[PDB]
């Protein structure tokens, strides 16, 4: 044996959580964060031009955009001359292939305009939707920056925006590779009317990729254009590993991807043994509760994993022609996709160690406290999750026109969470509502107090009368 | 059944809640946060021109006024052209009619001058009351702008300012529909002194209309010059909501408006016929003492909800006539005064959903718990309740004349709310007073901690012993 | 009673309160936060100059302060004109008489220079002292801001400063009444070099009177000079209110000024009969040990009080020659004075209020609770008290050289006050020490919680066990 | 003994306290604080020219590093005249000899480049290690800025650095003593490219002598070169005391370092005495643990003393040569050791006081105190322990290449600190992962609350039941 039993599942436990363990600190490059924070900065807090004090992260109207993107958009994409034309940026980045510039629009007339108001406003564009996008030409034909192109012919996908979702498809123009073109296809995009009343969004993609250490870093900025007036912009910087097997660290990491497959490999086989007949009821104590979870996660993680790295020389090729745009996203988007799933998959391997320590001597130290609050913590909850979610209710209809952090109603109950902590903005609530402001912010900070001891008074009380 | 009578009294309380809920997700627009963003965007960060720094938000004298209502304020008004003479604010918020701005101020000769300052000073201007009002003409007369008009000829009512009350009369002008006569008018106003010395408070007001999505929004801009000088900003914006029943999703609004007020009918008729004799303790439990309340606010909303929907074609009668100014401060106040109504009523009502939950074996945890504290939590903080009192007496007469925070004794109670959690400006209580400062800071973060322990601990003591 | 004996204690109680509160309401005036505001604002925060954005709350060499000497400060000091020679700060705040500029310094050769840097280094300025004091005159003579002059010629008093405490005498210069004049003197003061090598304090002192209500404000705005290099701004706003009597309000204060030194004379007589051979044990339930103080407290406050009104007219006297500098230090130092004192005694006296309570049936609910914590609270914390000067002495030891927070001892007992609450600046802290910052911060927010739960663990051990 | 032997324990122990209070006091000197706010603000706020707002705390390119090289950094070390060529710098500062510029490079040609981007890229320049450091000259020669030095001939250590941990060897320059020279020797630097592509950091480094208080002052500004672009500066401003033995207090000082010499010797041999034979458990108690750490930490101080107080002259002699580089940098860094060691001991010593105090009959409430949790605080904090770890690398794994706060695992830990406290940057958080986010937050913030009351709970009943 029995103590043999349980050691045998301790080392294979310690082998399997050492495996992952490496494969975490490999995959996690170091440093890496400096690469979009130089990235980040070069793009975003530089003013558009000299005079005006405006950068990217501060835009207001759609002028600002087309001084943006003649201005300081093309003085840190086009890099003069190192001492050919390959416009490495920071000297060290070669920026890859050309970047591509694409719009969303929609249709005039989508209300159902006001009988009143029909003799002086014409003309609608209802906010973004499929059901409202716009599919025909407009302005001087004269190629493909004026003409609609499906989301499959236009090689790319959808995207998650802060307003809405946005299809991936639309008007589409593909840059140079050099500075005086594409200031010159701008000016002509300014001049003959782009961005006219219809636009819904505009997006700006390229990518870059350094040679000193290898990672491409792929870049999408985002200007939603609101059916109300003005701009909100987005980045998402995001860097990639496409090239491996380069040096015998990789090989390494290969061999421990190998290892870690035959581990959960070896750990569903013997767990699905467990369940056949006996233990019937296998689902209880919540250890097995978790163990399943893991290998579940585990096989996804290797889904992802087998679907990006077969797929790289497919959408790679464009090594045989650099004077194209290069698709990205795909491969950006799964990355993302595969590091939650990892982080999560070593965060319920690193909290199932409990199972081992408890076979010393933590039965009262631990057995009893979780089993001490399984009716008593959850069963006093009640009350106070209740009055939680009538707060946010009420602070999401009383704010949320005026103040940022109220909006969305989601959102409201994230500021609750920083306001009994101590992150507080009461100045703008304040300003918002000088009556109801001030009212809201103490009942509940002293509500949340007066129930919370209320709950540890009666949890203490009771406890003691039936244990008397 | 009985349980079959608690049932049906569950199954009426859910359709009554879900009513409830689906009109206030109705009545709560989506994303109309961002349109009031934008407004104040452009009209209080713009630099009132493009050399100084300053903006409304920070003004400071009276020529940062006359620089900002020719600068920035008509430059964010008046918009050039789309590719008529019609101003559609970020080319789709269509201007309505003409701005106004108004002027209150007092008369000279209203001290009692110390007679050693005599022969020193000659005027006085006293702070804004409605004693101290100025009612003769003064200037070059010619118009409207230089005559006292009534609050009744002033088609108007009064507001509430950070300083005082104001009455809502006044010297008032008109501007145009274009930015040459508006800047001219200004110039004209500017040159023969218009604000000298007596005047009290300045009102800008406008009202424009989005026709994407269908949306007043009110504006009213106010400066306070104070007695002893300089001046205070205030915007205060709000959307607005006139024109109704363009979509099928109003008529299924009004159609939840009307079932939610049989719903409150037949609630009050039911509580009405159970108070008739029997129960005449009626009043306890607390249960009860809230479902009355509910149905009060209920009618109240009923009221306000029915003042405000019949009188909008009574003053919408700006349709006819698109040349003068719009009043509508009525219908964004009592827009105002609903929502906190309905915020109130649907607060309490998702509150009261305790009393279901109750007659299952969860009975006998709120026993102790919404019991036995009745006369220990609200017994033992009566010593803490006072000693916070006097600490916010302390701070208001300490401080208050350097420190914002601790300025009109009421804020200083809630500033006392926020050292507690951690929002504290240490910086400038220890530089208005390096000795009482950090005394008070130290002192009340010390006591209010240590009271709280003691009344913990003899809650515990006396609970335990009580029940030993 | 016995009941009768204690109500009519009570009734005189609530007189003796409420009298209080009256004078406090009465001496506190309304909205005066906002005059300092205005006058903190304009000679702070406006830059020196049209180009350079530095002020006087950022200050940084000599020239930095020359700049501000001559440019924003004549510019806020000086008003051209209404619509004589009179200068109406804001148009409403006569600038009284002339302000005046003072400067201390002391002598050259104050070091034992060591003998190895005897041929490199000349001459030697130490840090301000008594003892290392300048008495000599320098420069051309021509008049008294080249010559010393004792602090009884010289009339005024010394002044508390952030670096060390400075006499009150020094080389002082009265300007003009106008703005030419003050332009000519300081760039007359600029060529012959005033500020050189020595001075170690600059003092700059004027006042205004508001007339439309009658307020005093004293301005003494001090720039020190260490004996390292650059310069440490302070500025000192205060209100003051000299001419009283002037509204029906001002006797009705003075009425109760005369009837609160009757109660407290009533008061003291009392506490001396009870005191003078029954109870020689009277200083004991620490009631009476409040309810002497508050009289002390109390006739303290009549000194002042008496002390700073009788002293006016022979000071305002200014009022005969409106041409000369007006002293009011003196008065503004006791206002602060009465001001600390009297928010002290009527925090005592509000606190004072439970000795009233506790004769109904809440004395079993502080009775108990003031003769048990007597000794677990104030006994148990004694390790708390002894870790806490031991970290504060750790981290004026590592830090204080680097961090502002962290430097004058005492200060860094604040900051950790600030530091369990939640107001903490990691940032600067981990960038001084790289190794003991981090482990300092998490060492101390670690241990503090450990001992305060074993404080509180045990006392409730102690407690049931105790009462088992 | 009893009480005599345990008295006259007590009273050394205060001598030897008193001593080292003294000693602290006298290391510590006063308002030393302002002497490096003034450097720092000097050498890192003023912006590097006139027009552009980028200081050195905030640069971003190589370009941004070559103007601060020669404008900023000139203008505010060589100061033009007093009223010789001295540089005094705030007029009183005295800049020792000369500025040295150094800098640390790597070869060429340092990845395995893929195969696939060989046609596209020809060269690389990896990270610094010391692998890959450079050692070949390049440009023109002529002297020792193009030329490697040792870093045994370089006269110099190592730097541990905020990517890596730099050699102390490279390519240096001696700037001169004007500034017209060392102008145009950095105008010859940068036209003969000196940072190319291969630089990976370079030093600044010099020192100054304030004659008033004598202290010295060493500078070493550093600008690291990543391989990915950009730069990352830091400052590291150290003040100095060299020459002692000037005034009596030197000399008191001194023979409190002597008597707290024998206080140790004596604590030792006592200390050795009382653990020859008896008492072979003599490592109990936590005390007799504590004081050898206390005498350990003595000795290893002293020595570092007397190391470095007799090292001086041997680096001094600087005093016959006012024209070279004085290598301060191993003086400053064993001054900040011994800060850090004897700030340790003192705090040691401080808490050791807890000895005495319990010899009272406060014995009885140590004893539950600081064991009644030995194995109860300790024993049931396994658990928080580990789910603390978890979600720190959870945080790394998902945040840490976006944000700041979670690079560089570690700092997770201290970013975790802060969020329990209320020191929280959630807009960040959020806008890096907006699903992932706001759950880890959420979650976190929830489980430590609800396992840290688990623990409470379970840890008062344990104790209950246990002493029922
Ligand atoms: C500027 C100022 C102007 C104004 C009159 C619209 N405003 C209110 O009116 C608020 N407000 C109530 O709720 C309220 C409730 C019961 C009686 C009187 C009032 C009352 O007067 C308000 C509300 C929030 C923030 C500023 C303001
Ligand atoms: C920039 C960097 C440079 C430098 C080398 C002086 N620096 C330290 O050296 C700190 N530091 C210790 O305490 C320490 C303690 C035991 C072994 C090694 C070290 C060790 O290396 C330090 C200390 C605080 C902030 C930055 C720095
Ligand atoms: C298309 O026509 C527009 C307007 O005449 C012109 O600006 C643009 O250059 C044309 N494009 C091509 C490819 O001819
Ligand atoms: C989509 O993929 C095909 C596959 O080769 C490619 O030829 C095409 O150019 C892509 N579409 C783009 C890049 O718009
Ligand atoms: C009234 O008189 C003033 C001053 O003479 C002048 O500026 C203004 O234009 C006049 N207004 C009218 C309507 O005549
Ligand atoms: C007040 O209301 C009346 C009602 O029609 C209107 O005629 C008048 O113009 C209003 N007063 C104004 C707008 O000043
Ligand atoms: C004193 O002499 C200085 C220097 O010669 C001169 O600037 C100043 O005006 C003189 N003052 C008087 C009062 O003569
Ligand atoms: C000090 O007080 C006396 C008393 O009248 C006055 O004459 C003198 O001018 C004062 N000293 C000054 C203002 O420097
Ligand atoms: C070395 O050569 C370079 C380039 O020709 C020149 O700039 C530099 O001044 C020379 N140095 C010496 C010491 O001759
Ligand atoms: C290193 O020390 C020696 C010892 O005198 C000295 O001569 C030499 O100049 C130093 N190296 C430098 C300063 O680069
Ligand atoms: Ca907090």
């Known amino acids: 044996k029995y103590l043999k039993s349980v050691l045998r599942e301790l080392v294979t436990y310690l082998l399997f959580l050492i495996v992952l363990c490496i494969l975490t600190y490999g995959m996690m490059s170091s440093n890496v964060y400096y690469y979009t924070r130089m990235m980040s900065q070069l793009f975003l807090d530089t003013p558009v031009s000299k005079t005006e004090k405006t950068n990217f992260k501060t835009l207001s109207s759609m002028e600002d955009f087309w001084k943006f993107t003649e201005g300081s958009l093309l003085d840190g994409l086009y890099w003069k001359m190192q001492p050919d034309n390959r416009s490495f940026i920071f000297y060290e980045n070669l920026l890859l292939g050309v970047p591509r510039i694409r719009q969303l629009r929609v249709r005039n007339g989508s209300c159902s305009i006001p009988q009143d108001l029909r003799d002086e406003i014409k003309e609608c564009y209802d906010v973004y939707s499929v059901s409202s996008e716009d599919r025909a030409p407009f302005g001087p034909r004269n190629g493909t920056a004026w003409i609609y192109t499906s989301e499959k012919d236009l090689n790319g996908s959808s995207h998650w925006g802060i307003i809405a979702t946005y299809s991936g498809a639309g008007y589409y123009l593909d840059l140079s590779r050099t500075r005086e073109e594409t200031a010159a296809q701008v000016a002509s995009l300014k001049k003959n009317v782009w961005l006219d009343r219809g636009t819904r969004a505009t997006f700006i993609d390229f990518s870059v990729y350094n040679a000193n250490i290898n990672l491409f870093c792929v870049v999408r900025l985002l200007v939603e254009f609101p059916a109300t007036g003005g701009v909100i912009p987005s980045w998402q910087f995001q860097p990639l590993k496409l090239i491996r097997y380069v040096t015998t660290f990789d090989f390494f990491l290969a061999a421990c991807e190998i290892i870690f497959c035959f ?66 996203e795909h491969l950006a988007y799964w990355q993302i996709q595969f590091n939650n799933i990892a982080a999560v998959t070593v965060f319920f391997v690193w909290i199932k160690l409990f199972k081992f320590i ?78 109801l402001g001030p009212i809201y912010f103490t009942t509940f900070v002293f509500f949340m107090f007066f129930i919370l001891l209320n709950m540890f008074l009666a949890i203490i009380n009771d406890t003691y009368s039936e244990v008397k």
Chains 1, 2, 3, 4 share one sequence.
């Open 358 to 435: 408890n076979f010393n001597r933590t039965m009262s130290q631990l057995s009893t406290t979780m089993s001490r609050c399984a009716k008593d913590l959850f069963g006093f909850a009640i009350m106070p999750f209740i009055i939680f979610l009538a707060y946010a209710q009420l602070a999401y209809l009383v704010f949320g026109t005026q103040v940022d952090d109220f909006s969305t109603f989601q959102e409201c109950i994230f500021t609750q969470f920083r306001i009994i902590l101590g992150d507080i903005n009461f100045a703008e609530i304040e300003e918002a509502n000088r009556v």
């Open 263 to 328: 581990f959960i490999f070896y750990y569903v086989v013997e767990e699905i043994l467990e369940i056949r007949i006996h233990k019937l009821h296998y689902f209880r104590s919540f250890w097995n509760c978790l163990d399943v979870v893991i290998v579940v996660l585990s096989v996804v993680a290797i889904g992802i994993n087998i679907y990006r790295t077969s797929n790289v020389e497919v959408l790679l090729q464009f090594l045989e022609d650099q004077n194209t745009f290069p698709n990205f």
